[PDB]
Amino acid sequence: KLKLSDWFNPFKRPEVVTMTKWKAPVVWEGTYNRAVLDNYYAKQKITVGLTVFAVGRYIEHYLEEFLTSANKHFMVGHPVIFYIMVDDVSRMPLIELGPLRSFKVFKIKPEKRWQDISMMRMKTIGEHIVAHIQHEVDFLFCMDVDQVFQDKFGVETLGESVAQLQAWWYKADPNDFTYERRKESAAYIPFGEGDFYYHAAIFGGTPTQVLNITQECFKGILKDKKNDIEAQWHDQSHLNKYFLLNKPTKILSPEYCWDYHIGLPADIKLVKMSWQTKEYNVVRNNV
Ligand SMILES: O=c1ccn([C@@H]2O[C@H](COP(=O)(O)OP(=O)(O)O)[C@@H](O)[C@H]2O)c(=O)[nH]1
Ligand SMILES: OC[C@H]1O[C@@H](O[C@H]2[C@H](O)[C@@H](O)[C@H](O)O[C@@H]2CO)[C@H](O)[C@@H](O)[C@H]1O
Ligand SMILES: [Mn+2]
């Protein structure tokens, strides 16, 4: 029975948003007591899962770097299982894993459009959660492969449902957010509504919550297809619609998924993960 005050101190970061109107903490460097959390979770003997997809040239361009960095920085001190989804297992980079890390790898069907490869992840993750992840871990994170861990990404990020603030918009107002604005889409968020602009590159929670996130998001994806419309920012638009309707119990600051192209302002004290430079001309095969 862990209590927020037991590990979260918002006063440590007075210059940023540390609490939502629905009482959810926004985890910033300096606000968390990882030692207290590590002991707490270690006593419960938790295991944390991490899913990552790599289809096409994303495999050669990002998978090794992602996995090598995850091995070194993700939930260190706790049992972790990496779930790798690739369309070609023969191109799977097999790196050496460290203490408390293991993995499995699954061959998936490569969708023709990169937009569907990104969106289909929602369906696939749900299938795997029901098939086995729900029986293997206490918490699960789903991440994009085009990024790299830079420092400790630990238990301070765990929660029922966890959302990530997108680096470029954490200081902007909702009406400036690139939410889906067409009412015909299931991801529609009207102007005048919205809390934050979440990044689909990182989200997680308990297997139960993530199953609901991926389900619902995929239902919206399929609905739009039936109405001959596709969200401008695909699964990210749908994920934002979901988190608006079902508020996350925990949010991570941009320090947990930073884009160095922005530079490094005062608010970003310690980067835990950074974006890989975009290389669409090579890794994507369609507009
Ligand atoms: O052809 C593709 C398109 C997408 N993805 C996966 O889906 C995520 C979403 O895509 P991307 O990173 O290209 O989205 P962006 O962050 O640039 O919007 C990627 O990180 C990959 O894990 C993939 O493996 N192959
Ligand atoms: O808007 C969703 C979309 O943002 C891309 O990042 C943009 C950012 O939104 C824009 O404000 C800035 O000027 O340029 C960035 C491109 O580097 C993300 O790359 C994309 O994945 C989505 O998250
Ligand atoms: Mn990405």
From Swiss-Prot:
Topological category with respect to the lipid bilayer: Single-pass type II membrane protein
Residue ranges the record marks as coiled coil: none
Superkingdom field: Eukaryota
Lumenal-facing ranges: 1-287
Binding sites annotated in the UniProt record for Mn(2+): D144, D146
UniProt key word Zinc-finger: no
Signal sequence extent: none
Single GO term (MF): N-acetyllactosaminide 3-alpha-galactosyltransferase activity
Pathway this chain belongs to: Protein modification; protein glycosylation
Location(s) in or outside the cell: Golgi apparatus, Golgi stack membrane
Enzyme Commission number, as recorded: 2.4.1.87
Example of a GO cellular component annotation carried by this entry: Golgi apparatus
Active site, UniProt feature: Q236 (nucleophile)
Keyword Translocase belongs to the record: no
Chain positions carrying an annotated carbohydrate: N212
Top EC category: transferase
Sequence similarity: Belongs to the glycosyltransferase 6 family.
Domain notes: The conserved DXD motif is involved in cofactor binding. The manganese ion interacts with the beta-phosphate group of UDP and may also have a role in catalysis.
Annotated protein name in UniProt: N-acetyllactosaminide alpha-1,3-galactosyltransferase
Encoding gene, per UniProt annotation: GGTA1
Entire-sequence positions represented here: 82 to 368 of 368
